Every structure is written in C-alpha cells, then in structure tokens.
Design an enzyme around this catalytic site. Sequence first.
Site, PDB file in Angstrom:
ATOM      1  N   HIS A  69      44.548  36.712  27.700  1.00 42.31           N
ATOM      2  CA  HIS A  69      43.411  35.972  28.123  1.00 42.31           C
ATOM      3  C   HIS A  69      43.776  34.710  28.938  1.00 42.31           C
ATOM      4  O   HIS A  69      43.343  34.343  30.035  1.00 42.31           O
ATOM      5  CB  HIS A  69      42.555  35.927  27.051  1.00 42.31           C
ATOM      6  CG  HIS A  69      41.148  35.143  27.386  1.00 42.31           C
ATOM      7  ND1 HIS A  69      41.005  33.939  27.206  1.00 42.31           N
ATOM      8  CD2 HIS A  69      40.138  35.905  27.804  1.00 42.31           C
ATOM      9  CE1 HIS A  69      39.789  33.871  27.787  1.00 42.31           C
ATOM     10  NE2 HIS A  69      39.075  35.027  27.837  1.00 42.31           N
ATOM     11  N   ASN A 161      29.054  35.206  26.845  1.00 44.60           N
ATOM     12  CA  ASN A 161      28.462  36.435  27.343  1.00 44.60           C
ATOM     13  C   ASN A 161      27.851  37.208  26.420  1.00 44.60           C
ATOM     14  O   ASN A 161      27.733  38.389  26.032  1.00 44.60           O
ATOM     15  CB  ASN A 161      29.840  37.170  27.219  1.00 44.60           C
ATOM     16  CG  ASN A 161      31.004  36.640  28.192  1.00 44.60           C
ATOM     17  OD1 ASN A 161      30.698  35.979  29.045  1.00 44.60           O
ATOM     18  ND2 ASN A 161      32.224  37.085  28.159  1.00 44.60           N
TER      19      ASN A 161
END
Length: 279
Positions: A69, A161
């Site tokens: 990530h 998100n």
Amino acid sequence: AAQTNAPWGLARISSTSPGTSTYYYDESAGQGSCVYVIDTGIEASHPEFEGRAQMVKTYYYSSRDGNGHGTHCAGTVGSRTYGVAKKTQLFGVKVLDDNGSGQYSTIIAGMDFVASDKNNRNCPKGVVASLSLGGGYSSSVNSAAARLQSSGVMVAVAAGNNNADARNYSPASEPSVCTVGASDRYDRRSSFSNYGSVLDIFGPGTDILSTWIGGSTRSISGTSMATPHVAGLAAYLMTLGKTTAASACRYIADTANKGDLSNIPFGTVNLLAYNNYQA
Ligand SMILES: [Ca+2]
Ligand SMILES: [Ca+2]
C-alpha cells in the site's frame, strides 16, 4: 515535458477534459521538495524511485513495506513512470503494519515525527505529507493532523472509502488539512468515495496504476490513490513557487477543474485537481 501513454490519473490532472493519455508537466517535476508518505512503508529499492526514496522512521520491528500500500501511494507521488512529481524526494514513515492496520496512538506519533524531522532535512521548496489512511472520528487524530499542518507541512489526507459523509472519519474531518475524495476515468465520483462539506478537492482514485512491492506494479482503487495525486501536485506547485505549504490546498482548489464531476451530492465541492500547465 510530456509523458505519452501515462496512467489515466496523471493525464487527467493535466487536462481540462477526461479521456486524454498524455501527462503534460513542467520539467522541474517537484525537484527540491520533500513528500513524507505516512503509511505501511516504501520499498525504496524499487527502480522506479531512482534512489529518491528512503525510509526515515518505523513503528514496527522492520522498516520494510510488507504490504504494498505505502509503496503504491509513494509511487503516485513521485515514481518515474507513475508519479505526479517525478523528481521529488520521498520519505517513508511506517505507522501501519503489513496488514495495513495501525493504532491511533502510532499514527499520531508518526505525524508528530514528521513535524520535527523535517527540520533535519534539506527541502528548500517545501514539505508535504500524504496520509492515505483513517478510521472513525477522533479529536486526537484530527489535532495531530492540524499540528502537522501548522508546523509548515502541506497535509493531504484521504476522505475515506465509506460512501458516506467524511465528517465521521479522521483525520478526514480535520478542517485545516486537505481532504481528498476520489474520481474515476469518466469523471464520476468513485462509487466508494466519501463526500461532504469537509472535502477540499477530488483526485483520480479508481483503477490507479503504480509501484508495488517485489519491484512490481499494480492497479488498485481508493480515496487513498487520490490523496497522493494531490500531495504530488502540491509538491510540484511548491517547486514552481506558485504556492506554499500553508496555502496549497486552497490554491489547488482555486485552480481546479470546476463542475466536471458527476454524482457529487449537494454541498460537496465539484473540484478536480488540475496543474494548469501551459507549455
Ligand atoms: Ca472540463
Ligand atoms: Ca480543509
């Protein structure tokens, strides 16, 4: 400068319209700026970083990015092929473990670290911090982000998100930083992107190609793929002398593509990060 067949997100931030393929940018490319990537770490050995990346702090047993990530986000900031600011200096601060998780206390420590550590670094064009992370509302986490901003760092954070109002997430909900939502290649708000009055700006976040661990690449999606677009853009504009760490989020919003995005709820800015590059 022009990068042909660039990832769609890079092309998008240098165009007033969707559907282009060339990333147009000034060749200064964020040289002399510094971006701290506060995340799972950075695989600094990736050829794509060209030796411009280094780990400066870890809160775990290793400084290695065992997830990918952080490496992806760093790549969108400043890798050769996938980066907005192709000549910036990248600093890795590992506050997240190799599963991409981290305690609020550790994330706060990492922010405080950057506020101090920047004083040990030569960053004549200024300093940016990119925070592609967050959880539920915390005044402590918000305050840490506010301190980092106050100390003279351009702080960019992911909106989250959750397809919800970012007011209930941190550090997204801290007003004084730059809160970044996500769009897709057809100029729609990304299906997962948070929204709300706290958002300052949108960046490309759906299907973003960048660097990955093991010297690889991959495409993934998230508000956090949009955050480093804005962080890199900040560094780029700061190198050009158009703006400062204190004012860059506002400058980016001032100069954004306005009204191009769809499924933006009433009360959320319709502003898409744009470099306004004119050759
Ligand atoms: Ca337009
Ligand atoms: Ca803000």
